Design a protein around this ligand. Structure first.
Ligand SMILES: *[C@H]1O[C@H](CO)[C@@H](O[C@@H]2O[C@H](CO)[C@@H](O)[C@H](O)[C@H]2O)[C@H](O)[C@H]1O
Length: 312
């Protein structure tokens, strides 16, 4: 094809990106955003802190901008995220018992209700499991509400929006390990009990060369549970600077990940976390690392571009 949009389009898959609405005013960014993707998710606009800064005082400004961009260009809209322990506004953290549960339910209801009909799928709960299996210990949701907060959130989301696909999202669950084994048990139990859950999202903030060789097998075992699977946040960081060897590996890595999704009939698509390395979140949390995206800081197509196109 001519673009990754058409490559993905022809494969019947989604290929998305994390949008920062403030960047649509940089011509080069919009040009790429417009032509190379078929799905979009808000990078930060739809999180709890961005949407409910004070209790019951909602701010859908940035959220709507992203949603409007999707409808105006004809792209699918992915929602991220309703419940996530990180970046939980301070007012929520200081709540407890029923008052905390009430705030969670109200946040879920209101945010899902506002975007009803626009958002096709939602990341209802994000990062609930601990690396090493079991439930995340440092989550205010887990501490205050116990094991059942997840089922509560999913039931509230479905109550507010009857048609959006409800997904459970997590990172470091790409391969078969103790954390994905725990996730797998939650998904099996939910489907058995009739708890509304339609998909499983796999983050995938990988490092160049450390791509689990059993990605497919893992993606496929979830699919068999009766849910859709998707890669919700891809990037392959490296130690900078980069050279013709790091990029050539990373190019191979993108191809593996996209290729694993293609082999699982229920893998809806791949979503890359940004457009250009210029605005990547990596340098800020991983000092010394970066160059994780498909486009460099000068909007040049890195080798990974041709790899993703081939993978589709
Ligand atoms: C996958 O991890 C990325 C980066 O760690 C998250 O996006 C970033 O979130 C932080 C905090 O909310 C922001 O500072 C960045 O602008 C944003 O790119 C995803 O939310 C997460 O799912």
């Amino acid at each position: 094809a001519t673009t990754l949009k058409e490559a993905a389009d022809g494969a019947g898959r989604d290929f998305g990106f994390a949008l920062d609405p403030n960047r649509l005013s940089e011509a080069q960014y919009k040009a790429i955003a417009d032509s190379e993707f078929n799905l979009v998710v808000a990078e930060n606009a739809m999180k709890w802190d961005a949407t409910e800064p004070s209790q019951n005082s909602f701010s859908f400004g940035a959220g709507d901008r992203v949603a409007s961009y999707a409808a105006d260009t004809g792209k699918e809209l992915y929602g991220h995220t309703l419940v996530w322990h990180s970046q939980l506004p301070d007012w929520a953290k200081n709540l407890n018992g029923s008052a905390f549960e009430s705030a969670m339910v109200n946040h879920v209801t209101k945010v899902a209700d506002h975007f009803e009909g626009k958002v096709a799928s939602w990341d209802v709960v994000n990062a609930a499991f601990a690396d090493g299996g079991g439930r995340r210990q440092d989550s205010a949701f887990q501490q205050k509400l116990g094991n059942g907060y997840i089922e509560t959130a999913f039931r509230a989301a479905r109550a507010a929006d009857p048609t959006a696909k409800l997904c459970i999202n997590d990172y470091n669950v790409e391969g078969i390990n103790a954390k994905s084994n725990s996730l797998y048990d939650l998904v099996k139990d939910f489907k058995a009990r009739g708890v509304p859950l339609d998909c499983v999202g796999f983050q995938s903030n990988l490092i160049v060369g450390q791509v689990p060789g059993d990605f497919r097998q893992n993606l496929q075992r979830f699919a068999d549970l009766g849910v859709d699977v998707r890669i919700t946040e891809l990037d392959i960081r490296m130690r900078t600077p980069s050279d013709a060897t790091k990029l050539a590996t990373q190019a191979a890595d993108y191809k593996k990940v996209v290729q694993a999704c293609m082999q699982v009939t229920r893998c809806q698509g791949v979503t890359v976390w940004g457009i250009t390395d210029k605005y990547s979140w990596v340098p800020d949390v991983f000092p010394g690392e970066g160059a994780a995206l498909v486009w460099d800081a000068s909007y040049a197509k890195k080798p990974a571009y041709a790899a993703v196109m081939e993978a589709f």
